[PDB]
Amino acid sequence: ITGTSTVGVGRGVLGDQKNINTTYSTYYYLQDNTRGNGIFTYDAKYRTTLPGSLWADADNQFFASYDAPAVDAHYYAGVTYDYYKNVHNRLSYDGNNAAIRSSVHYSQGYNNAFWNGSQMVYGDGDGQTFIPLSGGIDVVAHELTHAVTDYTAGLIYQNESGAINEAISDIFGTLVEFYANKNPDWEIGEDVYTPGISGDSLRSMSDPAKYGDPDHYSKRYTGTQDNGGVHINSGIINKAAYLISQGGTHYGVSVVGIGRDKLGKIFYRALTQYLTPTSNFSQLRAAAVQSATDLYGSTSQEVASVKQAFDAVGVK
Numbered sequence: 001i002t003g004t005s006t007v008g009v010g011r012g013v014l015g016d017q018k019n020i021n022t023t024y025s026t027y028y029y030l031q032d033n034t035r036g037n038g039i040f041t042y043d044a045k046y047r048t049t050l051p052g053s054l055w056a057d058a059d060n061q062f063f064a065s066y067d068a069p070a071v072d073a074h075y076y077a078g079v080t081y082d083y084y085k086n087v088h089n090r091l092s093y094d095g096n097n098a099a100i101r102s103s104v105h106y107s108q109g110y111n112n113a114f115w116n117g118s119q120m121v122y123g124d125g126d127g128q129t130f131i132p133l134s135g136g137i138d139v140v141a142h143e144l145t146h147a148v149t150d151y152t153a154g155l156i157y158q159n160e161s162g163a164i165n166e167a168i169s170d171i172f173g174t175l176v177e178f179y180a181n182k183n184p185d186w187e188i189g190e191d192v193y194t195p196g197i198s199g200d201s202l203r204s205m206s207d208p209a210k211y212g213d214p215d216h217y218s219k220r221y222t223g224t225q226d227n228g229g230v231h232i233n234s235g236i237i238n239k240a241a242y243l244i245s246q247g248g249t250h251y252g253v254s255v256v257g258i259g260r261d262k263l264g265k266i267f268y269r270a271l272t273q274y275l276t277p278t279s280n281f282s283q284l285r286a287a288a289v290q291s292a293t294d295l296y297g298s299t300s301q302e303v304a305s306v307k308q309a310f311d312a313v314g315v316k
């Protein structure tokens with residue numbers, strides 16, 4: 001909407017206070033004009049029609065329980081925009097400052113979040129499996145990264161290309177979590193998953209097997225559930241990424257870690273310059289090796305470490 005840029009204040013899903021960029025015109029709207037062509041947050045009102053209504057508030061204060069998922073979707077979309085711009089020189093998900101839209105309060109007891117081709121969508125959870133999913137910065141960045149992938153590599157959402165698609169969202173979700181630097185880790189969704197159980201998460205990149213996912217190509221799922229295991233086989237690539245960054249010895253194969261920033265550079269380049277809609281795991285290895293070669297040189301430690309990591313997870 002047309003109005004003047006303002007700054008509201010509220011509390012997120014985890015009870016933390018934060019400032020949010022809003023727009024004033026009669027009401028204060030969750031419309032952040034400070035980033036690209038805007039970040040817009042909508043209320044789906046427990047229904048499934050999208051996007052719903054642009055979030056409007058009478059007083060620019062967002063401390064109601066109902067407000068919390070909107071505060072976090074809006075704010076974490078901002079952090080994710082900043083990560084892509086500042087770290088990768090990418091302007092929004094399309095590279096041309098496309099407006100970023102999110103809807104919260106989607107459906108009832110909805111234990112998921114997604115990118116629907118046009119916008120991000122967040123359930124509130126059922127209160128047992130999840131609390132409102134926008135409360136996780138890794139979750140918000142995971143979802144926005146699906147948009148980046150769709151605009152770039154275009155990885156088809158099934159089988160190996162789909163597992164790469166998923167891993168890319170977990171990798172950048174995690175790198176954004178480290179960028180914001182609040183309780184960062186290599187787990188996915190820990191801030192919003194199972195409020196009654198401490199110390200767990202939806203997936204682990206450092207040890208995918210902890211939550212039942214493969215950490216070696218020999219253990220890949222080849223059935224039809226989950227679009228051919230896109231959230232399962234992602235563990236193989238997540239493990240490789242973790243090893244590239246942090247190092248380790250995995251099934252007897254030692255990897256020298258090169259750190260998160262270089263992991264991010266290598267995978268961002270692979271995603272945007274080398275991967276295609278049908279890339280498989282072997283092709284991702286080749287894309288990552290070439291990306292590291294471009295950035296650091298063929299004889300670099302960075303290239304050697306990428307090879308070691310894919311060796312460790314059984315991807316040739």
Ligand SMILES: CC(C)C[C@H](NP(=O)(O)CNC(=O)OCc1ccccc1)C(=O)N[C@H](C(=O)O)C(C)C
Binds near residue numbers: 111115
């Ligand atoms: C980071 C997570 C908290 C959320 C994450 N959601 P996602 O974006 O991967 C769900 N994907 C999804 O709905 O794709 C289907 C689709 C939806 C709309 C248009 C095209 C394709 C996830 O891992 N979801 C899991 C799954 O869908 O298996 C669930 C179990 C949480």
Ligand SMILES: [Ca+2]
Binds near residue numbers: 057058059060
């Ligand atoms: Ca208010």
Ligand SMILES: [Ca+2]
Binds near residue numbers: 184190
């Ligand atoms: Ca964390």
Ligand SMILES: [Ca+2]
Binds near residue numbers: 184189190
């Ligand atoms: Ca995390």
Ligand SMILES: [Ca+2]
Binds near residue numbers: 190195
């Ligand atoms: Ca938990």
Ligand SMILES: [Zn+2]
Binds near residue numbers: 142146166
């Ligand atoms: Zn996903």
